[PDB]
């Protein structure tokens, strides 16, 4: 029972960790898309400056 609870707790940890990792992958994918959105925003804003400058 300690061992089964352990396999279950270890599984919970494995799956929770699988999700710590899946979440970190999504966080980094989203943070990367965010940083990229912000790089692309800074670019869009710089290109906006070029467009306004063009205006």
């Amino acid at each position: 029972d300690a061992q089964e609870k352990l396999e279950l707790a270890e599984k919970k940890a494995t799956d929770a960790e699988a999700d710590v990792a899946s979440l970190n992958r999504r966080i980094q994918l989203v943070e990367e898309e965010l940083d990229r959105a912000q790089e692309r925003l800074a670019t869009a804003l710089q290109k906006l400056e070029e467009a306004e400058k063009a205006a």
């Binding site: 396999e7 270890e10 990792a21 992958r25």
Partner: protein, 375 residues
């Protein structure tokens, strides 16, 4: 004793045989791959003494027996002894036999052809199995691990294969066959324990050492730090009681033996080590494959039970691998028993029911059929 009309599964190596029936998640029993024979002439009447001992009988009576192992670095050469082992396994102890069930046996991907030919032949001709299927250990290792993609580190008794699979396909040029496994680690430990004053020469002694290793030894996350302390202080030693009343303690030898996997030069082997062979099985695959294999490094077989191996192999590969990317090792409780489990999965999958050789096709074609029907 069983009434489930399913396939039977066995993983047969140079040390142990795992066996049970397909559809379950574990072997029913594990037997030594041993046919034991007396090494002494009996004198007294009423002392028993068999002409031969099989599996666990041979191991239990080993103090007075010579123990023969039929499998040489993954290949069965002594088919007669394996037939005895299989009879005992199936008929006497698992209480289920091939005569009434399809049977799946395993081998390494580059195992010499004669092995799969004899495994197929013995089940059909001496056990009268209705059907056969010789499986690839790499396939089974990933099924049992929940993967279609990954590196299989199948560290067995006589050979470590190191073989990648991607999306269910083999990547054979990236296989790093290695002549280092659990039996070589046992032989090395016998020699370094001899250095400590406890010589081990006989096969019964080899079995004592294998027991010491399995309970006392580890690889270490950081070899040099454990070594420097263990080689300098008794605080790193662990005791084992030998079956004669002596007590043996082991210090840096406790990890130097297991270290051989990372440093094969310890036993005179020409090899880069298990972590570089793992790295090359990933690196020799195409660049849109490499990333998935790095993230899916899968342990199977035994030796995977050494403390520090799942953490160390991940450390050694991530240290060689590029940054940002996640490197992960899969090392479940099914460690060392996962090949058998994979065999159960493959044998029972509905997607596999057309892969079986029936005792129709076999009888007309002969054992060469294994190359037409299995792989």
């Amino acid at each position: 004793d069983e009434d489930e009309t399913t396939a039977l599964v066995c993983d047969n190596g140079s040390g142990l045989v795992k066996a049970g029936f397909a559809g379950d998640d574990a072997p029913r029993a594990v037997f030594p791959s041993i046919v034991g024979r007396p090494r002494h002439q009996g004198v007294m009447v009423g002392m028993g003494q068999k002409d031969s001992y099989v599996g666990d009988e041979a191991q239990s009576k080993r103090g007075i027996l010579t123990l023969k192992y039929p499998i040489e670095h993954g290949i069965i050469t002594n088919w007669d002894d394996m037939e005895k082992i299989w009879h005992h396994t199936f008929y006497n102890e698992l209480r289920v036999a091939p005569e009434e069930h399809p049977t799946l046996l395993t081998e390494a991907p580059l195992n010499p052809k004669a092995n799969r030919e004899k495994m197929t032949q013995i089940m059909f001709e001496t056990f009268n199995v209705p059907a056969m299927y010789v499986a690839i250990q790499a396939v089974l290792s990933l099924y049992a691990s929940g993967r279609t993609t990954g590196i299989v580190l199948d560290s067995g008794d006589g050979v470590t294969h190191n073989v990648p699979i991607y999306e269910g396909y083999a990547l054979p040029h990236a296989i790093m066959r290695l002549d280092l496994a659990g039996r070589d680690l046992t032989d090395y430990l016998m020699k370094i324990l001899t250095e400590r004053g406890y010589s081990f020469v006989t096969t019964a002694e080899r079995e004592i050492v294998r027991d010491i290793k399995e309970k006392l030894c580890y690889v270490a996350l950081d070899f040099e730090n454990e070594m420097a302390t263990a080689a300098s202080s008794s605080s790193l030693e662990k005791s084992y009681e030998l079956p004669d009343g002596q007590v043996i303690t082991i210090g840096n030898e406790r990890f130097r033996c297991p270290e051989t996997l990372f440093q094969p030069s310890f036993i005179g082997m020409e090899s880069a080590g298990i972590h570089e062979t793992t790295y090359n099985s990933i690196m020799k695959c195409d660049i849109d494959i490499r990333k998935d294999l790095y993230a899916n490094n899968v342990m199977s077989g035994g030796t995977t039970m050494y403390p520090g191996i799942a953490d160390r192999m991940q450390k050694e590969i991530t240290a060689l691998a590029p940054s940002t990317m996640k490197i992960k090792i899969i090392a479940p409780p099914e460690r060392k028993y996962s090949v058998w489990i994979g065999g159960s999965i493959l044998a029972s999958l509905s997607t596999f029911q057309q892969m079986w050789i029936t005792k129709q096709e076999y009888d007309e074609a002969g054992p060469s059929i294994v190359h037409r029907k299995c792989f």
